[PDB]
Symmetry: C2
Subunit: 203 residues, 2 copies
Amino acid sequence: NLRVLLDTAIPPSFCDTVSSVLLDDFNMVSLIRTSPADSLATIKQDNAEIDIAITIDEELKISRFNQCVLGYTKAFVVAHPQHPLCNASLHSIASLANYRQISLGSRSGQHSNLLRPVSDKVLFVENFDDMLRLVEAGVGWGIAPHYFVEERLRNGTLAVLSELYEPGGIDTKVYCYYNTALESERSFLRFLESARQRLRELG
Amino acid sequence: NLRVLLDTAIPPSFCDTVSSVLLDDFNMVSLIRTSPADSLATIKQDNAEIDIAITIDEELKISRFNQCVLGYTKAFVVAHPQHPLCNASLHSIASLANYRQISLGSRSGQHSNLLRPVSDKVLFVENFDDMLRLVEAGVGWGIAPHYFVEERLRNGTLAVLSELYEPGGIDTKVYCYYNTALESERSFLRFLESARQRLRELG
Ligand SMILES: N#CCc1ccc(OC[C@@H](O)Cn2cnc3ccc(Cl)cc3c2=O)cc1
Ligand SMILES: N#CCc1ccc(OC[C@@H](O)Cn2cnc3ccc(Cl)cc3c2=O)cc1
């Protein structure tokens, strides 16, 4: 009985080639979604008995778990096309700390260095859809995975601000936190390669 | 009079296409090398009057400076080919926290989350050459830029441990910390693109 956690920032499609692989080796496989901001909070609860977590969030050592890199995914800073900072200049990008940010909140109330909001003017939400609702309505700017803002960008309903900061979008590591048991377990190594293979393709 | 800081982790070659560009626009251009672990410590000293810093080190806001991404470079965990952990398994990689690490030290004595040593058994050095001296002699393992360990790897004098953690080597962002003045300054934007172009090629 394997239990896998995937945060909202992982493409849902990524699951496709992965869950096939696990199911070839494991007979029961449970899949769980959390906010990127709740992933690590969740695996630390011992009763949660999570075996593997795929998440963008980073911490330097979780008691029962080793860490490794599955690959990279792109996220963008986005606002209402006629947001003040729409011109996307370097002065614009510096000033994100002053303008209202739509951030993912956390059960634990606390945030990693990676996921903490950057502005004093913050408005917390439980998922990216809620976030992008308020960003379309010009309530604030937010940062969200490619696969969320892909549609709304071509539709002209949202504008990118991030390009002069990180051209091509903000590259962000997809980490795999795994219960120590699964080191020297050919099942997990089998998963690890196909998972990497899969996430290279989505690039 | 421009003053640019490049840490040891930046390929020396990167300077080539860059310093040409700056010199087309700026008439005096001073180039300074520090340890990655001293880069940000240095620019914070006000008398240091650094205008631009190219460094792998990360912090969330430095008073007088904005941040952006120039691109990505690869670093590897390396040891003596017959180091205990030479087999490079996931149990090996987890155990790096127990075996002696050769780390870059810092004037400020303190380290960023990114650059802090991961093991209790640490031996500090001022540069990568000193580091790789002691790692060849099996004194410990260390992590160093590609361009340092490139030679010693083909020569069989050093072995990679990092592959099952991050296949292809540990991708690490090259950041550009720049004095706020240089936002809305076509000279700097001119530098910013060629710098990105240059560092894409070195990939
Ligand atoms: N232009 C610009 C640069 C810029 C980048 C990040 C900025 O802050 C966002 C922070 O609130 C927390 N953060 C950071 N990196 C993430 C990566 C991926 C994903 Cl999916 C979510 C996040 C995320 O929430 C601000 C400015
Ligand atoms: N196998 C394995 C995974 C692993 C990665 C880093 C590990 O820790 C190194 C730390 O001491 C501080 N660090 C982190 N990332 C760096 C990136 C580039 C460069 Cl050039 C230097 C550094 C660096 O010194 C340990 C294990």
